[PDB]
């Protein structure tokens, strides 16, 4: 389906604001987000993701603490390891960019 639809994906106050502020990003460094991302067959909540891999400490964190399968339990995507590996990907295909740009104050935190 269409990126719009990671809008649906929770009711958090703040993933409006996160959401337009991650696509304007991505239209800036010129790969604009016109699909929802997705892992296999499942949607993937980017934003969620993007969340919770901070509350983990970012990637090499995700990585160190081998938390790539329990999040993908937690943003239903699948449970296997081969859906762990996958979200890894997505995570570095479509946000490591931005935590990085953020973490070095070149883009201001959301
Ligand atoms: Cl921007
Ligand atoms: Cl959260
Ligand atoms: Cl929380
Ligand atoms: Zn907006
Ligand atoms: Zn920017
Ligand atoms: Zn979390
Ligand atoms: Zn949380």
Request: glycine letters at 6%; proline letters at 6%; hydrophobic letters at 35%.
């Amino acid at each position: 389906e269409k990126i719009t639809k990671v809008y649906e994906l929770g009711n958090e106050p703040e993933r409006k604001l996160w959401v337009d502020r991650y696509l304007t990003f991505m239209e800036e460094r010129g790969s604009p987000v016109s699909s929802l991302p997705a892992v296999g067959k499942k949607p993937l909540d980017l934003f969620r993701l993007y969340v919770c891999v901070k509350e983990i400490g970012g990637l090499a964190q995700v990585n160190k603490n081998k938390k790539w399968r329990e999040l993908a339990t937690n943003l239903n995507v699948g449970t296997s390891s081969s859906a762990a590996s996958s979200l890894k990907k997505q995570y570095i295909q479509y946000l490591f960019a931005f935590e990085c740009k953020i973490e070095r104050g070149e883009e201001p935190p959301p």
